[PDB]
């Protein structure tokens, strides 16, 4: 009747901001130019995660960002290892070749348009597909560790105070 | 290794489960291997520790026994009583859909186990149709309890399955009970319509449907549960009429749910509406034709200092 | 964005239409009782293939049907191997298990209905299911080879039998060799009993039909034509398995000739000018070419 | 198209005999005072023009010359096709010539890979097939058609295949190189074409269908994979072994297992018009955004095909909706392809408001967007596949069965 796909768990690191770690207020802001932030806000103000979020959290996320220069021909990500990074579509053509049952197939080429990689921030999931860079460019390397930590800390502080 | 194996019983992300024969008595039992490979590769020791601490002092009819537990230099095997019968999802897919009494009994058992877990401050967490065992005497049993928590408190855990989530879990918001109630509103759908609830070729559609609470009235559905399904999906929980802290003075006073003699159901006496057909020791007609994978025993000590609580 | 799917080539068994020699009527013979035959017919009527088949083919398949007795714990059909058989659960219940990424998940069973491996007869493909015994029972069906052979034989008989019965008519000069097949395919079939009027009197006769089987006596009401006053059987043109009628109805445009009458079980065709006017258009301009004959 | 002699029914000498009858018939049929629906005005104007030109040979001489030239061209094409059919060809190939590089894609029939010539040196495509799978299925009739299709090529669309080579247990066939990619991949990546792109695709489809019908060669096979985009900005078809032209009917069901009309599912005959139906559903993928059949079991697909019902979201065009609504009955008897010339109702439809096949006949119109050509060996557009060398023993396996090649 149907193939009936599996239903594996989606557990992850139980981040309990209460008595974990030792540091505090580890924001690590990375400011940049104003034009880049203004251009990125147009796309950041439309994601399901940012559609309902406090302006302070959005500003903090926009301020905290790391850039990485990727040249033509570089297999930085491959379907196999675990996935912990959120890549934003800044500029340049990037092909998404997924290994469908061990066979490469282009899913959807991204050229300074669209949004992807947010699924990696939902739970512990391996690499979505191979991101082949057709030409040089500068991508945004946002790790998973940073996103949950302040995004939950602000809510906890607001619930404790407010 | 004081147990003679027979044949595998199941393999998946949760782990491996095989069938063994007690050498000291001669009885078919289930043996679940923890492996620990995925645990170390995915970090899942907290859930196991919580489940162990819960089972240390928890016992109810809707729970599996913990008889002999074995830990090796690099592996762990948990023994449990086997319940020949198989899961109900197989029969549901073979036939198609059950009747109203079946759904009523399912809801009764669900509220009963919910009240039992709340009596000692517990949360079921994961809930899927692949965690039910029906014996010949009608005694239903539940398996897979690693996804639990000692005290509700106020954490921000993220797990389960994409097919059973709510906006409160996507952005952790405590969900002390919504995750165990909102998602439940769709469970009945799986046992009502002639097709799975979520049918999409992309997780984005599933997420959009989960966020946008709206049940699609099937072409053939009873008008009794229609009003209940039209309101089961909600954001908050205080606005819900039938959602008292007791959980008994709300479902019993419902429209269709009225003659649910819980006094005779909680005491394990009323027979189930569908008893599986037995044949011999360790039946296999109800189970699938899954084969056995490559088994491997321990060689040396590698991660024996993990569960250092015994 | 989407789960996606494979684009594997599909296959079907070939045949040689030039090979007309075959069995006399059927190889396997096993006439069952009346109740079993009625149950099998009722179960097969639910299939889409049996929606257009005639009683003749149904009776042929019933007479050529093969029964197989399966005991408990028996195993013959298995997944992976090339499917070359087909059966139908006449009674009992047998759960079928299909592979699902190394897991033989169940699909269901049947009870005096269904058809295990019904698609295997439509095209050659490996076994995509697994049957298992449960209790003594009997399964009725036929292998793919004999079924395909009988189907192709019936198709060839229905395609070749119809045409030779029109080529004798000298009127047939405009139709080409390619249009003959289309005309034969467009031709339908209808049955008329005794007393059932084929068409009411006074209708606009602007078509053409040929009798397939059964004598047809055309009569009219004795009034305008000089003849006996008492109405009766008019000697217009008795049509039989070979004659024709309705050709003289596009250029003559004469008054109402007469009305046909189906005496008993009469099988006729079902031609129509709408289908012919799609390519060659109205036959009025096509028949004008052979003016030397009519003049 | 509309011959002046056939408009009113006249021989070589148009006299004042049937002209009056044709005029009266035309007047009784079309009447502006009583009829006002669209399409009738153009027909009446054309009929009046033909009637007024029939009375003056000065205006019909050009039409007569055009018809004579078309008839001569058709006769020459038929003679060339007959000569090619009656002309065999073999013993013009060798293995020690082209060296393989990597694999491009394998399926349930053959494997396309990349090869390079040892003499000059140029990247090309090569399809390899193994007789092990053909002997079990016995499909020599479909393979024999390629021996003649190799020579039956006298048009730009018809890919001029190269000389094949049969081995002891393997067959190789070299073809042209496609630096671009397939249309199925582009459709899956985008999922919704614009108006110009859709119009160009429809025009190319009509052109290739007319080209295939001119030779009376049944296409038979049809799938999204049979449509490659060359670097020159055009469309090409692959896999021609399924093609065959027989006087009688046929029964070899193989090609469109999913997109199968309800007339063939019952194991019955069919015509070339079905090629449109099997392709019509494809247009849905280029309009809605999702596949046509939203199920997985063949039973559901068959039920949806037999059940005459097609959704119409708020994304289809105006003429496409009417074209899809006109074709909905089970027994497609009023097909638009089963006509005299088969290029009138489709071209005169409202969908093709502006067309020009003469511009494409000579190949001189740049495509809307040509795939990026990053020099030779630009296999980035095509889908990747795992490497698989030829691991077969050198041993004869029924040679007489594969004599003609």
Author numbering:
A (entry chain D): 104 to 265
B (entry chain B): 96 to 405
C (entry chain C): 104 to 398
D (entry chain A): 1 to 405
Task: Give me lines lifted from the publication on this model.
To provide mechanistic insight into the functional consequences of the DnaJB1-PKAc fusion protein that might allow us to better understand how it is a driver of FL-HCC, we used single-particle cryo-electron microscopy (cryo-EM) to determine a structure of the RIIβ holoenzyme formed with J-C. This is the first cryo-EM structure of any PKA holoenzyme and also confirms the differences between the compact RIIβ holoenzyme and the more extended RIIα holoenzyme that was shown by negative staining EM.
We then further masked the core regions and focused on local areas for refinement. The overall structure reveals distinct density for 1 complete RIIβ:J-C protomer, especially the contiguous B/C/N-helix (B-helix, C-helix, and N-helix), the CNB-B domain, and the J-domain (top). In this protomer, the J-domain and CNB-B domain are in close proximity. This asymmetry could be an essential mechanistic feature of the RIIβ holoenzyme. By using cryo-EM 3D reconstruction, we are able to observe this state that could represent an important event in PKA activation. The J-domain presumably can stabilize the CNB-B domains either through spatial steric effects or direct interactions that are driven by the close proximity. This close communication between the J-domain and the CNB-B domain is captured in one of the protomers in our cryo-EM structure. The other feature that is revealed by the cryo-EM structure is that the A-helix in 1 J-C subunit is also missing, suggesting that the J-domain influences not only the CNB-B domain but also the A-helix that it is directly fused to β-strand 1 in the N-lobe.
